[PDB]
Write a protein that binds this ligand. Structure first.
Ligand SMILES: *[C@@H]1O[C@H](CO)[C@@H](O)[C@H](O)[C@H]1NC(C)=O
Ligand SMILES: *[C@@H]1O[C@H](CO)[C@@H](O)[C@H](O)[C@H]1NC(C)=O
Lengths: 49, 49
């Protein structure tokens, strides 16, 4: 309900990183979610105020 | 806590649609929530960019 039908702000609920969308996949006696997430990379130091 | 005392962004948690607010009602050995919800209607196709 929260990952597939929507976008969840809950941290590490629908996968690590910032959630974008999820895709359900069937399995024997279960369900498999492919949690697409946005992971930042290669940060840079900056002076801030 | 989440539906009555506040507004829930969780999809299909506090009712089917965009949750506005909920109202609790007591019942024997349980509780009843009246989930007020905003569901859109009257769609119209439009070209987008
Ligand atoms: C920022 O600078 C500190 C010390 O100069 C260094 O240890 C750190 O790795 C730098 N971070 C990045 C992302 O370059
Ligand atoms: C939009 O296009 C579809 C094409 O199948 C059509 O059925 C529908 O009536 C159109 N308008 C609405 C109400 O979204």
């Amino acid at each position: 309900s929260e990952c597939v039908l929507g976008q969840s702000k809950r941290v590490d609920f629908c996968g690590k990183g910032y959630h974008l969308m999820s895709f359900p996949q069937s399995a024997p006696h279960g369900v498999v979610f492919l949690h697409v997430t946005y992971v930042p990379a290669q940060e840079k130091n900056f002076t801030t105020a």
